[PDB]
């Protein structure tokens, strides 16, 4: 069925809320959306499984050796980095139009728009572009950070498609003040991307594609079907005809149901957002693998954690005292994380005590640890006035009002291991008087900007469990209030036009100072020292509750080659970063990568 019609069916447990047109990822920054988009949009510079930059739509990787990189000292130990990129003469959109520097200028104009709800306002403050000609441009970073040359580099969007509407949007934006009209301005920009990112719009041809594949159709709630993009210039060894001509992502929200489908055999490979660790080693799957599929476990920077709303303007937050570190420490002492990873994963996915995964050398193994101890949790909560009500749940008075310790606990509905986790933790939390109100929804709902990036508006008011998948551009921005080098605030609120990813609203000036300096440190050891100090502070304050570090399980049909992932392949550590060379060996596809060396033993 695979080599038969020369297709690739990929199974996933989460579906993108929007696709293609949301190129700054302001509406959705879902990992599944980014993975799928690798097939549809190619970078100028990619990042392979061997953790190396490599040219894709650009002619070559810029280096000091070839003069494409220029570092100049601007004083005070800071630098200016210039990076020359040349777009290949054959880089083309799926409609036949050339990919040019006008597409780069367009991308920058949108990212630079005042009030644009960008994920990383720091980048947008210090990065600029200079256009030499239709295919030569220079990216300018000032001050430069240690990770600016780290691929992938994808700074372009289809101007001939989105430009006309953008001009209208800009004209309308002139009548709005980013301060007083923040809500309206945010709506204006969201609507711009939505015109080019919903199922109906895309199915009617709203977008064009630069990757090895182009969209055929999006059946929302069911699948995303793509077909070969003949305009993509990188041809795999032996010719593109020997590789897959159609790629279909099938979405099954309940992970157990996805597991059943994967065991059944109709799915050729699994996404980085599919089955959980425990499922990958379950007997019902393992015993059905012989002669059919290979199962791999790939470590990555995947941090399962629980974010905590600490915005004091939400009275529920103040009532529960979530803004006090003692409350967060108490909750963590009540989470039997070691018991959970032992029972659920045989300890193979270790308890995390910091936000940086071990695969990143910045990881600090020495930070403060919070062992499972209900007595300690009880003492901390008692110190803050809590006393058990007759239903066994803690109560206290705040602002003259009687408040109960019932906390919202949100996660991705359908993800069985997380649903089990909530139940597991809830049993212990109840023993000390903390009640949990489960409020789960699909990935496409909870990871949409209007939910995840709106804690300041009290959209979610307690605990929110999920995992952050990181690339090597670590700057601690997930927990910075402000980057001191650019003055960019990283907590999304109406006041900063909903920019940033510090979704829980934490602020620690020392943490900001350390991380802001660390990203400017080009010496690996000094950089690590600063990040280690930042992690020590982070662990004492627990702005989020660390749970465990994950490894992604991949189930791949025998015969399919080059569908390989590594800790940081494609930047975030998932398959599909070399989508043009994935194919069936019986069709002549030439194996160029082997999963073994990047995966856990056996």
């Amino acid at each position: 069925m695979g080599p038969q019609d020369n297709s690739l069916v990929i199974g996933a447990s989460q579906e993108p809320r929007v696709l293609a047109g949301d190129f700054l990822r302001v509406i959705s920054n879902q990992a599944i959306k980014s993975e799928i988009e690798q097939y549809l949009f190619a970078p100028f510079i990619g990042f392979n499984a061997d953790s190396q930059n490599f040219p894709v739509l650009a002619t070559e990787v810029p280096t000091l050796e070839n003069g494409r990189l220029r570092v100049t000292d601007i004083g005070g130990g800071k630098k200016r980095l210039e990076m020359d990129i040349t777009i290949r003469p054959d880089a083309k959109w799926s409609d036949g139009r050339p990919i040019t520097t006008e597409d780069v200028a367009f991308y920058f104009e949108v990212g630079k728009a005042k009030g644009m709800p960008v994920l990383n306002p720091d980048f947008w403050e210090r990065v600029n572009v200079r256009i030499k000609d239709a295919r030569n441009f220079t990216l300018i970073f000032e001050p430069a950070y240690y990770y600016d040359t780290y691929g992938p580099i994808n700074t372009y969007a289809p101007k001939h498609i989105m430009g006309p509407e953008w001009e209208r949007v800009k004209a309308a934006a002139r009548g709005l003040d980013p301060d007083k009209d923040a809500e309206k301005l945010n709506e204006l920009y969201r609507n711009f991307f939505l015109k080019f990112a919903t199922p109906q719009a895309l199915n009617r041809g709203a977008m064009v594609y630069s990757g090895p594949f182009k969209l055929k159709r999006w059946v929302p709630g069911n699948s995303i079907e793509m077909e070969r993009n003949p305009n993509f210039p990188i041809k795999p060894e032996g010719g593109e005809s020997k590789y897959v001509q159609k790629v279909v992502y099938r979405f099954i929200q309940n992970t157990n149901s996805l597991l059943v489908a994967v065991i059944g055999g109709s799915i050729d490979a699994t996404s980085s957002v599919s089955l959980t660790f425990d499922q990958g080693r379950s007997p019902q799957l393992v015993r059905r693998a012989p002669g059919r599929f290979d199962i791999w476990f790939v470590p990555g920077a995947i941090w399962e954690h629980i974010d905590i709303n600490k915005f004091e303007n939400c009275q529920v937050v103040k009532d529960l005292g979530l803004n006090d570190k003692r409350t967060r420490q108490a909750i963590l002492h009540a989470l039997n994380r070691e018991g959970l990873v032992k029972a659920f994963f045989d300890g193979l996915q270790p308890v995390a005590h910091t936000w940086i995964a071990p695969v990143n050398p910045l990881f600090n193994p020495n930070v403060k640890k919070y062992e499972f101890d209900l007595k300690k949790a009880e003492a901390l909560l008692a110190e803050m006035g809590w006393r058990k009500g007759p239903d066994g749940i803690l109560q206290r008075t705040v602002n003259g009002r009687t408040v109960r310790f019932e906390i919202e606990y949100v996660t991705t509905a359908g993800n069985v291991v997380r649903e089990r986790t909530q139940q597991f933790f809830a049993e212990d939390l109840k023993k000390i008087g903390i009640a949990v109100k489960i409020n789960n929804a699909p990935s496409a709902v909870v990871f949409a900007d209007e939910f995840i990036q709106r804690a300041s508006e009290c959209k979610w008011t307690g605990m929110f469990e999920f995992a952050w998948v990181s690339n090597l551009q670590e700057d601690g921005s997930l927990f910075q209030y402000k980057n001191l080098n650019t003055g960019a605030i990283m907590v999304p609120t109406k006041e900063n036009n909903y920019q940033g990813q510090n979704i829980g609203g934490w602020r620690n000036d020392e943490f900001d100072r350390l991380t802001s300096q660390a990203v400017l440190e080009f010496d690996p050891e000094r950089r690590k020292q600063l990040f280690w100090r930042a992690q020590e502070i982070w662990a004492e304050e627990l702005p989020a509750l660390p749970l465990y570090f994950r490894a992604n399980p991949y189930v791949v049909r025998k015969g399919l080659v080059n569908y390989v992932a590594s800790a940081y392949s494609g930047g975030y550590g998932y398959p599909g970063w070399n989508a043009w060379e994935i194919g069936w060996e019986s069709r002549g596809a030439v194996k160029k990568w082997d999963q073994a060396k990047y995966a856990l033993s056996t």
């Binding site: 599944i32 957002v273 952050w468 990813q501």
Partner: peptide, 5 residues
């Protein structure tokens, strides 16, 4: 910009 899953 870390991604969610």
């Amino acid at each position: 910009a870390s991604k969610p899953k």
